[PDB]
RNA sequence: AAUUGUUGAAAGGGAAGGGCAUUUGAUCAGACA
RNA sequence: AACUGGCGAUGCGGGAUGAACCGAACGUAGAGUUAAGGUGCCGGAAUACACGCUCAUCAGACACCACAAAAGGUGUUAGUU
RNA sequence: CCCUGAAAAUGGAUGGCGCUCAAGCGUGUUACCUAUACUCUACCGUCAGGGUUGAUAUGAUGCCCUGACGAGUAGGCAGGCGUGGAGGUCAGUGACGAAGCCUAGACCGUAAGGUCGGGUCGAACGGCCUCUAGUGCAGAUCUUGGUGGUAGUAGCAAAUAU
RNA sequence: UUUGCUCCACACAAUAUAGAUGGAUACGAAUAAGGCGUCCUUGUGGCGUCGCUGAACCAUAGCAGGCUAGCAACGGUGCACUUGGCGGAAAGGCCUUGGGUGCUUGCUGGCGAAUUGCAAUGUCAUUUUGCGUGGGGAUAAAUCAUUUGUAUACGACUUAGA
């Protein structure tokens, strides 16, 4: 209607890191309204899209997507680890992100 | 070291899952009963549970039955260690020395 | 959650607000802090006066300008508690900072928007009852902050227009919950009641 | 059409370039190992370039295979191009660089005839 | 040192040809698991008798479960500990519901008030105080006055989201 | 070491920097406090030396 | 070759250059069949 | 001087920083589990839980380690005769 | 536990911000984060243990199974890469363009290095098995030559005057 | 200097983007106390009620939301117009009058949807600039040189010149 959102909103927080070396192969994902890591085993294996724009048209759009998947729960607060076709940019740190509802299980 | 008293349950689950043999070295996975038989059949022992039996009872051939088993190769414990600092005695809230009946839970997390 | 989060500083402990503001900032959440002068600091006013003076003495020797800059206004003190919790010399830090605004008083837009509170930095919830603490306005004014009277003038007039605003509001919601009572016991209402509403 | 092989996995596509080859002109990028006594590089301090070592060496399966699947062999004339006659699923022929234009057309041709791939099939091509 | 269980322990001076059936001594150790408990048993026996683990044996180690775990009790406690300047005995009174739940807060109190860690305390005696008014210490006697009641003012609520739109109460 | 003979500094730092000024008309950085009961008139004036 | 002029593209808040990784721009191989 | 372990000749993780400390010693990678050390924010990780203690008009805050003493206090704390 | 005792020279350091029912001190309970370590797999190389001359196709220092290991200065050894000349050979490349030089184009090698396109050029040159040494450069206040920043700067003001 | 500048209108084009994708939803103050309703003697007042989280409130069905019929209401909301008024802290936005108009899922209907082939953001934001079109509106100056000396190493300053 006014709303069409079929996914949950997310944020690209950090790469996996230690204090002093990061790992672009895993990004860490904050899912809106997901609080425990009990709460976040529901989004395990869901698919994630970071959508973005560009100025060159491509396959007939100026809109692009990087695709990924939740893979495990990260620490006590419902942050989630995830990996992507290509690694998310690092400029994207604190950019939004779509966790979808599929694969499903209800 | 941390050490103590294994149960049949964790001697079972060690041999079955991570037990290999020293067969001209060659660290050989067990995986079939006729691997054992060919080398410990000498002294009885013609089955994997035959191994377990001769181990868990310290029977007449425990030296060659034991040394046949290639030193086990565990992971870091799954739960973690439960101590904060490990290199104290068990009695002093660390991880080493004889913790006895509990050497199991530890092992069944490292397996 | 929201495009911009407006925070009523009044009642909030400096570092514990700075800490949560820093994190909302870095996770992409634009934030605006208001009434910074009504912000709180643990310890009585003297300890925090003394503290600001200790700050105040550090300056580059050969040229006092290139050295540390000391800012007097309750908001710049607040931004300072914040900036040091942000990797502010990086590309990403300048990013996150631009999402943040700090003000004395509640200036336009934000006086008509709703402003929100942070329980985990709320002094009345955080501090132990009986400790002594500091109001950032008094502390600022004692080290050079000029505009403490003007602000409370401008605010004492704000809080008037807003009481009126609230007044009309409370008067209207009396009608609405009035009409809401004629509609009760009807067929609709009792059904919703079943579905939790 | 090339004989079938596992996924070619390269392992380290980046060129190992000599230390400070990038810092003084005098110093070619041509790899040399740092023999000095302080050299972070030789010491493997965290954040310096990495050096060539034998873990990097490629899977014996796919080793020497160009993208296609064909170990390229160098060719100076038809006789040489002919040594590949019973091998085309396995051994492309790269025309030698000094082979004239009138002589690559003999070689290109004969390649097609016999079913052999030619890697650089365009040099001195009268277009 | 952890969450505590009470253990009776029983040992005896390894038998000899000319002294079979040596004499058997019991302690009640306050420890977390049975491996520590026996350690302590030998720690203390070698403080009274000519034994060590090397030459004796534990006869029985048995857990002791509190007799009435929903009967609030007033516990007197007797302690010896080492300070940074010497060693000294004490007596405290703990109000709780099982000998073991008290030994827990004892070691906490000893730690907070007297900076004494486990290694420096000896639990001389723990005892259920039968009649009231044998309750000597005040911080306990407060809780034994008739028809006692008391508010819990300035109540403070664990906020579950970062932002709030109210402005809290501390009401109660 | 340590001076030798203490002696006062040359010049007054509260007149720094010794640059040429913005314009020839130095500015009134301040006006009298206001007595809003008097009549109203100007509180400064201009001329040429 | 160092070094230089022009032209073209690009970056530059107290050096420059490098590692891992990815965005974007440019350029390219192979592989379909 | 003695014994061992090290550094030198050695990178990796912790100790902000650091030849020698803690952990752990290195072929190229993937998944997992951890060590020492940490988890307000910088900074990955509980503004977690529970009992106490401390309010400093120069509080205090983690080994090696980057110092403080005798002597005092009717601050408050719990104990002793 | 806190206070007093407790005095130094640029301005400044529990690492920083900051923190006071702590984000402080003692102690307890869990959860959680992440090393080149541990476990499993893949690939490389090393070492070892075995198997396999039976012709009628291609490697016997070869082929095939299997296990374990991999830090490194001085230093040893090994197996390779590149140059000038020399014996053999591919009846090798070339004025329908050899060598050389250029090239944020291409491919092979872990690497020394190797191969190709295109441009520029003009007379020679290479693979493979052997032979040989005036055989590999970043450094030696190295040798000879060339070139920068410096910098359109220092300066071009004695001797009277045009 | 080749018909330029500017405000409103639409069109094509380019170029962006620290990161829309139902709604940032307005008292103030206290916290060992308050919000709301109600009553009065209008108080530091009587009485009632609530909290214990926004887990809320509002919105939300319709080709991404198409084409149409009607009923019950006289309510709601979008738009462009107009009435009166408020807001200077950064007001640049808020409240109000009155018609016109679109929609209304408040209720009852007629019609459409496939083949995008079992997922591939499946494109619906808002930045800034550029080029022509015609609906309003507007017709400067600063610099060089010359010049004063309240100025000055040079730039700069300060004057003066139809
Ligand atoms: Mg980051
Ligand atoms: Mg991580
Ligand atoms: Mg990737
Ligand atoms: Mg960034
Ligand atoms: Mg960020
Ligand atoms: Mg885990
Ligand atoms: Mg678990
Ligand atoms: Mg653990
Ligand atoms: Mg620790
Ligand atoms: Mg396991
Ligand atoms: Mg953002
Ligand atoms: Mg400075
Ligand atoms: Mg800062
Ligand atoms: Mg940012
Ligand atoms: Mg509180
Ligand atoms: Mg390579
Ligand atoms: Mg060298
Ligand atoms: Mg050295
Ligand atoms: Mg070095
Ligand atoms: Mg030819
Ligand atoms: Mg060429
Ligand atoms: Mg050619
Ligand atoms: Mg003990
Ligand atoms: Mg003893
Ligand atoms: Mg003792
Ligand atoms: Mg909590
Ligand atoms: Mg002097
Ligand atoms: Mg003198
Ligand atoms: Mg002034
Ligand atoms: Mg003024
Ligand atoms: Mg600068
Ligand atoms: Mg085909
Ligand atoms: Mg040592
Ligand atoms: Mg040594
Ligand atoms: Mg030496
Ligand atoms: Mg060594
Ligand atoms: Mg070492
Ligand atoms: Mg380190
Ligand atoms: Mg450490
Ligand atoms: Mg240790
Ligand atoms: Mg920081
Ligand atoms: Mg974090
Ligand atoms: Mg001080
Ligand atoms: Mg003092
Ligand atoms: Mg001092
Ligand atoms: Mg302090
Ligand atoms: Mg110590
Ligand atoms: Mg330190
Ligand atoms: Mg003395
Ligand atoms: Mg003392
Ligand atoms: Mg005292
Ligand atoms: Mg005493
Ligand atoms: Mg204390
Ligand atoms: Mg200094
Ligand atoms: Mg200190
Ligand atoms: Mg810290
Ligand atoms: Mg702290
Ligand atoms: Mg603690
Ligand atoms: Mg648990
Ligand atoms: Mg937890
Ligand atoms: Mg490591
Ligand atoms: Mg590895
Ligand atoms: Mg052989
Ligand atoms: Mg080696
Ligand atoms: Mg080699
Ligand atoms: Mg050679
Ligand atoms: Mg040669
Ligand atoms: Mg030559
Ligand atoms: Mg040449
Ligand atoms: Mg060129
Ligand atoms: Mg090139
Ligand atoms: Mg180049
Ligand atoms: Mg190349
Ligand atoms: Mg090739
Ligand atoms: Mg090629
Ligand atoms: Mg050519
Ligand atoms: Mg040529
Ligand atoms: Mg000639
Ligand atoms: Mg030859
Ligand atoms: Mg030779
Ligand atoms: Mg020579
Ligand atoms: Mg060299
Ligand atoms: Mg060289
Ligand atoms: Mg040189
Ligand atoms: Mg040279
Ligand atoms: Mg050298
Ligand atoms: Mg030289
Ligand atoms: Mg010279
Ligand atoms: Mg020069
Ligand atoms: Mg000149
Ligand atoms: Mg000159
Ligand atoms: Mg001169
Ligand atoms: Mg004269
Ligand atoms: Mg941007
Ligand atoms: Mg308001
Ligand atoms: Mg009111
Ligand atoms: Mg009330
Ligand atoms: Mg009322
Ligand atoms: Mg009345
Ligand atoms: Mg009233
Ligand atoms: Mg009342
Ligand atoms: Mg509400
Ligand atoms: Mg509609
Ligand atoms: Mg319908
Ligand atoms: Mg009608
Ligand atoms: Mg109508
Ligand atoms: Mg204004
Ligand atoms: Mg504003
Ligand atoms: Mg305005
Ligand atoms: Mg209408
Ligand atoms: Mg609708
Ligand atoms: Mg669309
Ligand atoms: Mg026009
Ligand atoms: Mg005129």
Domains, chain E, ordered by start: 3-69 (3.10.20.10), 70-146 (3.10.20.10)
Query: In B 89-108, which Cβ lie closer than 7 Å to strand I?
Result: 93
Ranges of H-type helices in chain E: 34-45, 99-114, 138-141
From the CB of residue C14, how many other CB atoms can be counted at a distance below 10 Å?
Answer: 25
Ranges of H-type helices in E46-135: 99-114
Contact B51, B40 (CB under 8 A): yes
3-state DSSP call for residue B89? Answer: strand
E159 CA distance to ligand 23 middle (Å)? 43
Tell me how far apart the alpha carbons of residues A45 and A101 are, in angstroms, rounded to a whole number. Answer: 10
What's phi and psi for B13, nearest 5 deg?
Answer: -65, -5
Tell me how far apart the alpha carbons of residues E123 and E102 are, in angstroms, rounded to a whole number. Answer: 12
User: Does any CB of chain A come closer than 8 Å to the CB of residue C154?
Assistant: no
Residues of chain E contacting residue C116, judged by C-beta atoms under 8 Å apart:
163-165
Residue C160: beta bridge partners?
A: none
Residue A75: exposed, middle, or buried by beta-carbon count in 10 A (0-12, 13-18, 19+)?
Answer: exposed
Residues 6+ apart with CB under 8 A from C108: none
Residue E43: exposed, middle, or buried by beta-carbon count in 10 A (0-12, 13-18, 19+)?
Answer: middle
Residues of chain E contacting residue B105, judged by C-beta atoms under 8 Å apart:
none
Tell me how far apart the alpha carbons of residues E121 and E112 are, in angstroms, rounded to a whole number. Answer: 13
What's phi and psi for D72, nearest 5 deg?
Answer: -75, 135
Residue A103: beta bridge partners?
A: none
Choose the closest CB to E39 out of B91, B101, B102. B91
Q: Quote the crossing angle between the two packed helices B48-56 and B8-18, to the nearest 10°.
A: 140
Residues of chain E contacting residue C119, judged by C-beta atoms under 8 Å apart:
157, 159, 164, 168
Strand order of the β-sheet with E58-64 is E25-31, E5-11, E58-64
Can the peptide bond before residue F17 be classed as cis, meaning omega within 30 degrees of 0? yes
Strand boundaries in chain B, DSSP class E: 2-4, 20-21, 28-29, 97-100
Long-range own/partner contacts, residues E17-24 (CB < 8 A, 24 or more apart) = E24/E59
Q: How does DSSP assign chain D, residue by residue?
A: -----PPP--S--S----TTTTT-TTS-SS-----SSS-HHHHT-BTB-----TTS---TTTTTB-SSS-B-EEESSHHHHHTTTT-TTT--EEEPTT--HHHHHHHHHHHHHHT--BSSTTTT---
Residues of chain A contacting residue C26, judged by C-beta atoms under 8 Å apart:
93-94
Nearest CA distance, A13 vs chain C (angstrom): 6
Contact C115, C7 (CB under 8 A): yes
Closest-approach nucleotide to residue B86, Cα vs C1': H35
Contact C97, C83 (CB under 8 A): yes
- With CB atoms and an 8 Å threshold, state whether E35 touches B93: no
User: Does any CB of chain E come closer than 8 Å to the CB of residue C173?
Assistant: no
Choose the closest CB to C92 out of A30, A93, A96. A93
Tell me how far apart the alpha carbons of residues E14 and E4 are, in angstroms, rounded to a whole number. Answer: 29
Q: For chains A and C, what is the number of CB pairs under 8 angstroms?
A: 14
DSSP state of E47: T
A79 CA distance to ligand 1 middle (Å)? 15
Tell me how far apart the alpha carbons of residues B3 and B104 are, in angstroms, rounded to a whole number. Answer: 9
For residue C196 the two structure tokens come to 């939790």
Residue C181 Cβ < 7 Å to strand J: no
Q: How does DSSP assign D61-85, residue by residue?
A: TTTTB-SSS-B-EEESSHHHHHTTT
3-state DSSP call for residue A10? Answer: strand
Contact D75, D101 (CB under 8 A): no
Can the peptide bond before residue C95 be classed as cis, meaning omega within 30 degrees of 0? no
Q: How are beta strands A96-99 and E86-96 bridged, if at all?
A: unpaired
What is chain F's length? 49
C15 CA distance to ligand 56 middle (Å)? 14
Closest CA to E7 of E121, E117, E103, E107: E103
DSSP state of C95: H
3-state DSSP call for residue E80? Answer: strand
Closest-approach nucleotide to residue A62, Cα vs C1': J123
Closest-approach nucleotide to residue D64, Cα vs C1': I108
């Amino acid at each position: 209607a006014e709303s069409h959102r079929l996914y949950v909103k997310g944020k690209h927080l950090s790469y996996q890191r230690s204090k002093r070396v990061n790992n672009p192969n895993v990004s860490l994902i904050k899912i809106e309204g997901v609080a425990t890591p009990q709460d976040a085993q529901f989004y395990l294996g869901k698919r994630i899209a970071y959508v973005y724009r560009a100025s060159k048209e491509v396959r007939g759009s100026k809109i692009r997507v990087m695709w990924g998947k939740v893979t495990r729960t990260h620490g006590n607060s419902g942050v989630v680890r995830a990996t992507f076709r290509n690694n998310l940019p690092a400029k994207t740190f604190g950019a939004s992100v779509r966790i979808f509802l599929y694969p499903s299980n209800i | 070291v941390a050490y103590g008293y294994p149960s049949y349950s964790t001697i079972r689950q060690l041999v079955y899952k991570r037990g290999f043999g020293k067969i001209n070295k060659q660290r050989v996975p067990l995986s079939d009963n006729a691997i054992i038989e060919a080398n410990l059949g000498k002294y009885g022992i013609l089955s994997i549970d035959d191994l377990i039996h001769e181990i868990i009872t310290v029977g007449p051939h425990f030296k060659q039955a034991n040394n046949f088993l290639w030193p086990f190769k565990l992971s870091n414990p799954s739960g973690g260690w439960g101590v904060p600092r490990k290199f104290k005695h068990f009695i002093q809230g660390g991880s080493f020395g004889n913790r006895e009946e509990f050497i199991n839970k530890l092992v069944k997390s490292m397996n | 959650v929201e495009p911009v989060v407006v925070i009523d500083g009044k009642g909030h402990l400096v570092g514990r607000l700075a800490s949560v503001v820093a994190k909302q900032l870095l996770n992409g959440q634009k934030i605006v802090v208001v009434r910074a002068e009504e912000l709180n600091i643990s310890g009585e006013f003297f300890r925090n006066k003394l503290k600001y003076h200790d700050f105040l003495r550090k300056a580059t020797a050969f040229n006092k300008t290139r050295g540390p800059f000391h800012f007097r206004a309750p908001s710049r003190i607040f931004y300072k508690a914040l900036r040091g919790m942000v990797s502010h010399k990086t590309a990403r830090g300048k990013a996150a900072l631009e999402r943040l605004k700090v003000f004395e008083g509640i200036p336009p837009p934000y006086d008509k928007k709703k402003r929100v509170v942070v329980p985990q930095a709320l002094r009345v919830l955080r501090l132990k009852p009986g400790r002594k603490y500091t109001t950032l306005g008094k502390l600022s004014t004692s080290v050079g902050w000029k505009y403490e009277d003007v602000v409370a003038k401008l605010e004492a007039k704000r809080k008037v227009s807003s009481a009126e605003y609230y007044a009309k509001k409370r008067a209207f919601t009396k009608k609405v919950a009035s009409a809401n009572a004629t509609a009760a016991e009807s067929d609709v209402a009792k059904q919703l009641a079943a579905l939790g509403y | 059409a090339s004989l079938p092989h596992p996924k070619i996995v390269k392992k380290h596509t980046k060129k190992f370039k000599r230390h400070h080859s990038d810092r003084y002109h005098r110093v070619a990028e041509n790899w040399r190992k740092q023999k000095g006594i302080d050299s972070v590089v030789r010491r493997r301090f965290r954040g310096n370039i990495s050096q060539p070592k034998i873990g990097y060496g490629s899977n014996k399966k796919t080793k020497f295979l160009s993208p296609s699947g064909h170990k390229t062999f160098l060719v100076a004339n038809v006789k040489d191009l002919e040594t590949l006659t019973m091998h085309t699923k396995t051994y492309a022929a790269e025309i030698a660089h000094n082979i004239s234009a009138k002589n690559r057309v003999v070689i290109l041709a004969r390649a097609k005839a016999l079913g052999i791939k030619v890697t650089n099939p365009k040099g001195r091509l009268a277009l | 040192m952890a969450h505590f269980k009470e253990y009776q322990v029983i040992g005896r001076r390894l038998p000899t040809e000319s002294v079979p059936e040596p004499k058997l001594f019991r302690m009640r150790i306050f420890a977390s698991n049975e491996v520590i408990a026996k350690s302590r048993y030998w720690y203390f026996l070698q403080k009274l008798h000519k034994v060590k683990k090397a030459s004796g044996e534990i006869v029985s180690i048995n857990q002791i479960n509190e007799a009435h775990p929903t009967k609030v009790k007033n516990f007197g406690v007797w302690v010896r500990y080492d300070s940074r300047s010497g060693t000294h005995n004490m007596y405290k009174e703990i109000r709780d519901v099982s000998r073991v739940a008290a030994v827990e807060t004892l070691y906490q109190d000893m730690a907070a008030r007297h900076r004494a860690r486990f290694r420096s305390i000896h639990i001389l005696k723990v005892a259920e105080i039968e009649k009231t008014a044998d309750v000597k210490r005040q911080y306990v006697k407060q809780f034994l006055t008739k028809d006692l009641k008391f508010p819990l003012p300035h109540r403070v609520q664990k906020s579950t989201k970062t932002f709030s739109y109210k402005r809290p109460s501390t009401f109660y | 070491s340590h001076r030798k003979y203490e002696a006062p500094r040359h010049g007054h730092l509260g007149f720094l920097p010794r640059k040429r000024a913005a314009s020839i008309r130095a500015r009134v950085k301040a006006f009298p406090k206001d007595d809003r009961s008097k009549p109203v008139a100007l509180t400064s004036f201009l001329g040429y030396k």
